[PDB]
Design a protein around this ligand. Structure first.
Ligand code: A1B6B
Ligand code: ZN
Length: 139
């Protein structure tokens, strides 16, 4: 679990979105596993606008933050689940690191701010849904 609060927006993993998220929907994309809903309160976070390939993410299954090198946002195959059929997930970045179901929503940050959120994992890898291209979150 976990979310990004920026201005009047909440960014969450689409497969974890609540009834309230869907009732206040701004945008969603199943191919990215992202959903953005509106909020009444002003957010707590800032978004990075960069091409960093290093950062630190929060791993709830270990109650720890870990530094990672991660790949560029790309199209990567993801196996079927109670949430999605087998498909290519876009804007996904992989890193060598620990992750388990329940870790989705953990924030990845670089020196410039929020980069993305944990969205995939397994076999010593962790995948992050990128949010740096969503320039409209700022305005
Ligand atoms: C995070 C993790 C780590 C180790 C094992 C399993 C997992 C869970 C995982 O990969 N997904 C669960 C939901 C979100 C997901 C997607 N993006 O399509 C992928 C369906
Ligand atoms: Zn950066």
């Amino acid at each position: 679990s976990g979310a990004i609060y920026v201005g009047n927006y909440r960014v969450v993993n689409r497969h974890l979105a609540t009834h309230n998220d869907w009732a206040n929907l701004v945008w969603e994309d199943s191919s990215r596993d992202l959903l953005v809903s509106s909020t009444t309160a002003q957010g707590c976070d800032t978004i990075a606008r960069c091409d960093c390939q290093t950062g630190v993410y929060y791993c709830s299954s270990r109650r720890k933050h870990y530094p990672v090198s991660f790949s560029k946002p790309s199209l990567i195959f993801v196996e079927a689940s109670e949430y999605y059929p087998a498909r290519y997930q876009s804007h996904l970045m992989l890193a060598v690191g620990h992750s388990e179901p329940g870790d989705c929503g953990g924030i990845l940050r670089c020196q410039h701010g929020v980069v993305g959120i944990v969205s995939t994992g397994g076999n010593g890898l962790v995948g992050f849904a990128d949010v740096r291209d969503l320039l409209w979150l700022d305005e």
